[PDB]
């Protein structure tokens, strides 16, 4: 049982923006997941201070960086806070709508993509380099959902039932045949060495 | 009816060693600051995207900043979510005692003071310049609180009596007596300008 949404109009105008706009920068796109990751494993730490049964769904916080060269995927995982059904249809837990129109304007007044995660809409540039992306997500109030979207206007959400994750959440991204760099490990080692060296968890990269 | 708490000994640490290092570029608080009231707003924007009676305390989301040469304070008001008395008590709202960690190994690893907010705990910061910090506060949830510190090792707790605000945090700044630059309206706006251009809330410099 899928439910087909569509974005918001501003959404869905930032999405063709990202994937229309000639731009090499892409590796970015990593970073800026990476970057919401921490946030998440900061709020269910947060979380935790107080009420350590938060942690009951695993008490380890941490990102794991895997490629897969045969599905030609590669996945950020988190165990952090999770989505509810409502975070992931309320623009995955952001407020995007207004984070798109301060982008927006940054853009004309000079800005470059790379800025995106300032506006709180990093997320998006995840079609820098993915044709589709798939969330898997699992917040301690509410069931394990799939989200998803090739772009083009509309998403779905579905409850997951595939591999139980606990809590955090996955993000897949189905790489553009262009973009495959992105899988080799030597690639990946040094964006995360450039752009995430100071995050405060640790990130395995996963070897093949 | 006040409370005095000690701090835990990893963030005693950190304000002290804010307090004590040799470190010129000091004008970075007022950008972290701003960043944590940006944060705020965002989350109440969030929470009202699916109940908009959260607004009900004011609909208006905003940054203010109020130097006041008489009294010598700047404040940083915000309609943000606010905090409640518990997450006053929880280092206002932040993961500080693990962001306190990384930002400390960090520092030996090369990085410098100004790269604070990346660990989370950019509030402290505020002691660059101030001898004291009282924060006002008010979340839908509680009532409103004071939180107070001159720093050496503990901080105060009281519900506040004062004028109601509604929603949100006032950071009252009682500066250094050779910090009082950051009253004066030039050099506030040359610094708003410099670091938190691409807030997505208007900021407004009160003249005095
Ligand atoms: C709370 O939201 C999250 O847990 C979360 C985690 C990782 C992400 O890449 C993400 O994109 C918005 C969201
Ligand atoms: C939710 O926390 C807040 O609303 C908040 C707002 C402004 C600040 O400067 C701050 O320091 C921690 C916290």
Redo the contacts with the bound molecule.
């Keep these: 049982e899928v439910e087909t949404f569509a974005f918001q109009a501003e959404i869905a105008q930032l999405m063709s923006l990202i994937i229309n706009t000639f731009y090499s920068n892409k590796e970015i796109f990593l970073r800026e997941?990476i970057s919401?990751?921490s946030?998440?494993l900061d709020?269910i730490r947060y979380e935790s201070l107080t009420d350590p049964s938060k942690l009951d769904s695993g008490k380890e916080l941490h990102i794991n960086l895997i490629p897969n060269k045969q599905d030609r995927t590669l996945t950020?995982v988190?165990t952090?806070?999770?989505?509810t059904k409502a975070?992931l249809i309320n623009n995955?837990?952001?407020i995007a709508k207004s984070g798109t129109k301060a982008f927006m304007e940054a853009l004309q007044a000079g800005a470059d993509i790379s800025m995106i995660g300032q506006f709180g809409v990093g997320?998006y540039s995840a079609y820098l380099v993915a044709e589709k992306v798939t969330?898997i997500?699992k917040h301690n109030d509410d069931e394990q959902y799939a989200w998803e979207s090739s772009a083009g206007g509309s998403f779905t959400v579905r409850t997951d039932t595939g591999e139980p994750m606990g809590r955090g959440?996955k993000?897949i991204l189905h790489l553009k045949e262009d973009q495959t760099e992105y899988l080799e490990e030597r690639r990946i080692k040094e964006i995360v060495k450039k752009h995430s060296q100071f995050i405060g968890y640790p990130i395995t990269l996963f070897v093949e």
């Design positions: 997941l919401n990751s946030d998440a709020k950020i988190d952090g806070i999770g989505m975070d995955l837990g952001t997320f969330v997500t959440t993000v």
